[PDB]
Write a protein that binds this ligand. Sequence first.
Ligand SMILES: N[C@@H](CC(=O)O)C(=O)O
Ligand SMILES: N[C@@H](CC(=O)O)C(=O)O
Lengths: 501, 503
Amino acid sequence: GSTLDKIAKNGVIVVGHRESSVPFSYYDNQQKVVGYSQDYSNAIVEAVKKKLNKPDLQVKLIPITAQNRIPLLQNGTFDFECGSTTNNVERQKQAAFSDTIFVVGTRLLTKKGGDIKDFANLKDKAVVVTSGTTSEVLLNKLNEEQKMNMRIISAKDHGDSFRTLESGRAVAFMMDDVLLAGERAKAKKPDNWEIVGKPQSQEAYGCMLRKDDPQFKKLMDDTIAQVQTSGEAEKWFDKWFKNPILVSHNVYITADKQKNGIKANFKIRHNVEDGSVQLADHYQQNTPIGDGPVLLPDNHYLSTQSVLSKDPNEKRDHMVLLEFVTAAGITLSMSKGEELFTGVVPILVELDGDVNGHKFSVRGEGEGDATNGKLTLKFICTTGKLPVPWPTLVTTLVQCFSRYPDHMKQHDFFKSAMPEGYVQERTISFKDDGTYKTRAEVKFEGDTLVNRIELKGIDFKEDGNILGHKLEYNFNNPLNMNFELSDEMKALFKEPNDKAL
Amino acid sequence: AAGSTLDKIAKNGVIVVGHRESSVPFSYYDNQQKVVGYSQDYSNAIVEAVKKKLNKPDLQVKLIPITAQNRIPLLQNGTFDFECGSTTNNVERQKQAAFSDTIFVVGTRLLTKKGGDIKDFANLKDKAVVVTSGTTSEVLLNKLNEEQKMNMRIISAKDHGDSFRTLESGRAVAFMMDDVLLAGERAKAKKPDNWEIVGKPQSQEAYGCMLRKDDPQFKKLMDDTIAQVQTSGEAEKWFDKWFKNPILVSHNVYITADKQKNGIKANFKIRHNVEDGSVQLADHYQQNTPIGDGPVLLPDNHYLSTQSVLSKDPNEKRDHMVLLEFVTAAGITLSMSKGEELFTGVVPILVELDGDVNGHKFSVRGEGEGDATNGKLTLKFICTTGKLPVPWPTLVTTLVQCFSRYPDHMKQHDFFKSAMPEGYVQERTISFKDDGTYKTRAEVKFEGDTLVNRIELKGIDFKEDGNILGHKLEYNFNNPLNMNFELSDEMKALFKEPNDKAL
Ligand SMILES: N[C@@H](CC(=O)O)C(=O)O
Ligand SMILES: N[C@@H](CC(=O)O)C(=O)O
């Protein structure tokens, strides 16, 4: 028998994932399960839908830990898992493993400038390790065999392990080197932590499934090997390990039929330099300027990502912005205004602002490419220096440039209101702080899409995160990994295999 | 050939409708910025009559805000087609505009503090008095100030809400306006019972729907519609809805699929009335996952429209809450699961909650029934440990969305019923503004024939003096307003013989 028969009959595949194996299988700040291994898991699921000819197969992701993964496999709580599980000979007595998706060495994470340079320095020290892992076994064996008198703290997952080290309750955290780097990227001061020591082991990550299911295993292996030899595995590596990891924002849109328009709600979480976040709650209403027909949407959402940067040639207070937005939420030309966006469209943005009496103006210029959902803009404070952080103005500074998929084009209010345009009004509520109230007209003036805004901010705290300029210069809560592509992974990509190291 | 305004509407494919911002309860923004009211019921009926007259069933509507100051110029230059709100039809304004059949009759009076000095207009000598800019009452109040040499300091406020808050904040001793609008602002006051309508009416005035002059075909459509609604009994039913019964604002529970977990997510805001007249925001974040591993319905984005009424059982001496709730799904325009079939009848419900808020432990048990065919819940909840250490309204959302009514065209989007009988796990974080948070985990599933909601609630970081632990929340839901405004003899006579006469 085979699990693929259980799955075809049930119509659902049940998939285990980890909670804190960064950046392989973990919860993003919206509780979505993401990561390098989750990308393989998504590919394997798509392969299952093809093999079984079941394009509407459902997926149920359920969380597992290093401690309970094998018991939950063995009693059928999930069908397979991909995360950070080491394939080794001992575990092959209980389970089967796919082709290898990553290779690691087990090392130490410690504060710079100590006496922890290698495993021998753990003598008489408090050392943290995650329950149920290969490192926990290795560390206890080392403690016993070399008589090192460590006080080993066994924590329930990798984030808990790391915060033991971060809080000073342990001097080092032993784990897979890549996962040490993942927990480091999430730390308050990532620059404070270094990975040290001779690897105690070399270990291969594989997907785990029940034994005696060669057909199910073969579908995994074929999928992994194809991702690896086609080069996509390396592209996924660059995404998770060499570029900023972003979390998209969801702009939730509902029709406002009585105003022939829409309303939206969404939350922005601005990174604060101390490592906290500053919530900005957005309430939005839009209504057409013209008196002719628009498209009135069913509920849906926009998935948004923005990247803020600096222009080296500009000494004025400024912001360079790239933005990528796609609509979603409905599963499977519509307006005259839609036709105005099939090419590249020039954009002009003008903002007048007053925040706690501090008056300023902003001018932005660039282009929009709605076919690809992309914006490129450069903004300048034309009145001197900006009295608020640039990130707090991003949402205020043209959702007509969203990419609507073809099956959703009847729901694109924003383009349908063009060329006469729409009024966009927001109240942005900054938690424990003040409020922005904005009113803008978004419309074509000649061949240019113009966003003309007036902003009023009141009730802000002079020492708060906004008027005190405590926000990081970024968007979408980026995480940046410090981890090089090793020779072992270069070799893996050219020769997929499923062998324990 | 349909006349100017109907020709314009057919050309545009949209009818543009002026509305007021604070004419309560005729045409005003509710607390979710929806324009609502008695006059908007007429506006909607006229829009539907226009769709029929033009044979344009897909006609769109565009409401735009107007003021007492700018309503006539904006009408004259075609910025809107008509407005129904609280505009007096008088002979002066008929030089500039046309008026429909009358929809209400008022007298201009004073609103003042109950235990104070003002009993009639003469008591206003040498005192500060507020009135709304651009209204018939402003004209009357200024004429009385000069003709009786009263030395009044007349404050001219932007709209009726601003006028009333001038009175409420003590910056004026009285507010002169149409009596029903005074009653409307009073209903929205911090302490409605502190305010009294006094004085001999300075005028009697008829409200009409405004439209452009010299457009008889459009006026006739409006008059025929108004007169039909008034003689059929429908207008009296609207009157009861706005003036005799509690006005509620529905909550919108915004739902999106969570395909990874084979479930859904939701976000919404609850606004609890505070006893001092302010509101206490409760931001809700929700995640649902099926308990079973079989197929569910994964929905497109949509929302649930919810209203609840909280009451007391006269027989019950324990700390308790009687709850009646109605929920309908919406947000998608035009049997699907086995579990849907479990809800075609009346289903008994059991609710068990184990709570801990700032270390204060309590248990709640609820029983009743759900009728998903009509989106209706009837339950009674008892605090089985004694006094409830939080206000009952803060627990309503935690204490079975499977009983929502999904319209026929939306039944493929009902995750809640599709997960049955195995059920689902429902998790929430509820964030009270400037206060603590509730974290909840519940299992909703069939146990026998009974639909059971079993909850654990953990609340932390609450202020012992705040609105929750301090028991400062009103015992209600959906921000009710109560006009308690009687149907007058003049209104009965109007509905009997509709007419368009200025008074
Ligand atoms: N790869 C290690 C650690 C982990 O599971 O995250 C193990 O298999 O135990
Ligand atoms: N009915 C009065 C007040 C109002 O417009 O709200 C008027 O027409 O001026």
